[PDB]
Amino acid sequence: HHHGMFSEQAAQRAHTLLSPPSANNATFARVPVATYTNSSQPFRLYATRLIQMRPFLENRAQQHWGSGVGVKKLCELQPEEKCCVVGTLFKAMSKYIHPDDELVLEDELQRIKLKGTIDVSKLVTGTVLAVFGSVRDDGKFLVEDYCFADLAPQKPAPPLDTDRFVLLVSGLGLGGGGGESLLGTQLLVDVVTGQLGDEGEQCSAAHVSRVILAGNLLSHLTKKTQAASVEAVKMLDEILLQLSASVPVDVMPGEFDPTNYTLPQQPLHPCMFPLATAYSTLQLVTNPYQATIDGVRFLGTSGQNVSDIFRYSSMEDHLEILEWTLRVRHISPTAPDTKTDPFIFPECPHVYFCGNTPSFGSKIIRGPEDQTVLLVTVPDFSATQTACLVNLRSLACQPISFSGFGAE
Amino acid sequence: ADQLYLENIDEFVTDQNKIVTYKWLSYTLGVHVNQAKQMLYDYVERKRKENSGAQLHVTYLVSGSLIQNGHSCHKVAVVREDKLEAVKSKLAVTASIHVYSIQKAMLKDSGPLFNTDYDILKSNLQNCSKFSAIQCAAAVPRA
């Protein structure tokens, strides 16, 4: 989908700031940020997976290979029998993939090994597939074809009459990086706020409905180190403040932010952002974050999930790894069990984003029962100084890059 | 009226030797962020026609679309006076152009342009969106 990108709607009107002061001055009323619904409860706090996934992987294999029900558990397997086993994968011997790894398939009961034509550099420990082949003289199970649950059901987001934007940013990384990282950051804030730019920019920035910061806002003797870490947080407060005073802002915990390291990271503590928390517009959300903005279902994490799949996969492109999880109906299979897996898509998001990617990324993908889903990999602003702006009435991501001249 | 903000700015640049960014002037004279920009604009033209060679340096904010490989990226940049033409050209469709700062002495990097704005903020931390071109019904201290 291309139309209604930011730059376009932005240049949509005459310039004005290259002229002597006029009295008449435009001041824009932001869009009604009234239609929102945080829905990340299921984030506020391997059999079970296999149990929930089973119905899915089965109905996928059943359609993928027809009535010919290979539905046979790991126990009911008759050597040399062509069937379909549904289970969990385990691997064993930058990236920790081994020259030659191996995939063992676990059933609730036993666990069989795997041969055949199945990519290992691609799949990783925790995936839940529908394998097809027969048990061999080797004792190992040879595979000829496998599939995954894919995308869950998904009703279409209602139509919007006027474009609404969602600014996705990530990796502000306060603490280190050099003041250039700063001006850039100021410029970022100042654009959404309404400080810089001409009426065109402004009137469109004005159309931004919400701002999501996805983790890593702060990044990492004792005497000064403390002060520093304290200062940083302070700034982030100040930034969050300016933002809060202008538009709704959702903050997501990251790598090493004051909260649990495990995956469903619980929100940050209000005790950190005195200045900002004063605003009803600020909101500290869970890690894997879900919400429905202006009728569009968003879901994203501050990165980690993809960061891991990367460590144990061969996949290079994060945008891919991201698409991967969406196809494997599991936000982060690389994560441990603890009793419904929250990380299994109940319905399919409209926009699915990802944490501190090293580069901006975007792609729209479709699914079996034609579903539409916009993926986004929000770069680490710290080193990129970029963020995506998603227009919700068209699903168009477009990066925004800030910069200021250097000595040259 | 007008002849007033003009002197004010002169006293700032030339006499005080301060770096004048729209934001900074905005808060300083208490004026709409845009009208502040328009103010700098008028001030340079005068001082420029006046001396035709007065020690004055300007920086602009240029923003627009810049396609790299079929994929359109929006760019927002604070540039040094000269380069403005160059940057402006590289853009596919240009959205915003306006003065950003005014300084007597040229700046090595855009660095100070932050510091300046950052300080004046810490002192106004109280009301950031006061002179913004955007007002938000919800941004009212309640939660």
**How far is A111 from A47, CA to CA, in rounded Å?**
12
Q: Does A186 touch chain B (CB under 8 A)?
A: yes
Identify the CATH number of the domain defined by range A1-46+164-408: 3.60.21.50
Contact A291, A298 (CB under 8 A): yes
Please give the tally of structural domains in chain B.
Answer: 1
Q: Between A17, A27, A401, which is nearest B37 by CB?
A: A17
Domain that holds residue B29: 1-143
Q: How far is A333 from chain B (nearest CA, A)?
A: 32
Strands (E), B1-143: 20-21, 57-67, 72-80, 94-103, 134-135
Q: Where are the domains of chain A?
A: 1-46+164-408, 47-151
Three-state SS letters, chain A: CCCCCHHHHHHCCCCCCCCCCCCCCCCEECCCCCCEEECCHHHCCCHHHHHHHHHHHHHHHHHHHCCCCCECCCCCCCCCCCEEEEEEEEEECCCCCCCCCEEEEECCCCEEEEEECCCCCCCCCCCEEEEEEEECCCCCEEEEEEECCECCCCCCCCCCCCCCEEEEECCCCECCCCHHHHHHHHHHHHHHHCCCCCHHHHHHHCCEEEEEEECCCECCCHHHHHHHHHHHHHHHHHHHHHHHHHCCEEEECCCCCCCCCCCCCCCCCHHHCHHHHCCCCEEECCCCEEEEECCEEEEECCCHHHHHHHHHCCCCCHHHHHHHHHHECCCCCCCCCCCCCCCCCCCCCCEEEEEEECCCEEEEEECCCCCEEEEEEEECHHHHCEEEEEECCCCECCEEEEEECCCC
Cβ contact B142–A280 (<8 Å): yes
Looking up residue B55, the CATH number of its domain turns out to be 3.90.1030.20
Experimental method: X-ray
- Chain A: give the shortest CA distance to residue B116, in Å: 11
The span from the CA of A233 to the CA of A277, in Å, is 13
Q: How far is B60 from chain A (nearest CA, A)?
A: 10
Is some CB atom of chain A closer than 8 A to the CB atom of B17? no
Between CA A172 and CA A185 the distance in angstroms is 8
Return the DSSP state at B111: T
Interface of A with B in 265-304 (CB under 8 A): 275, 277-282
Given CB atoms, is A381 within the 8 Å cutoff of chain B?
Answer: no
Chain B neighbors of A194, CB-CB under 8 A: 33, 129, 132-134
User: Distance (Å, rounded) from C-alpha A368 to C-alpha A278?
Assistant: 46
**Domain A47-151, CATH:** 2.40.50.430
Chain B interface includes A118 (CB < 8 A): no
Q: Give how far Cα A19 sits from Cα of A244, B88, B98, Å.
A: 31, 18, 9
Q: Which residues of B touch A281 (CB under 8 A)?
A: 136, 138-139, 143
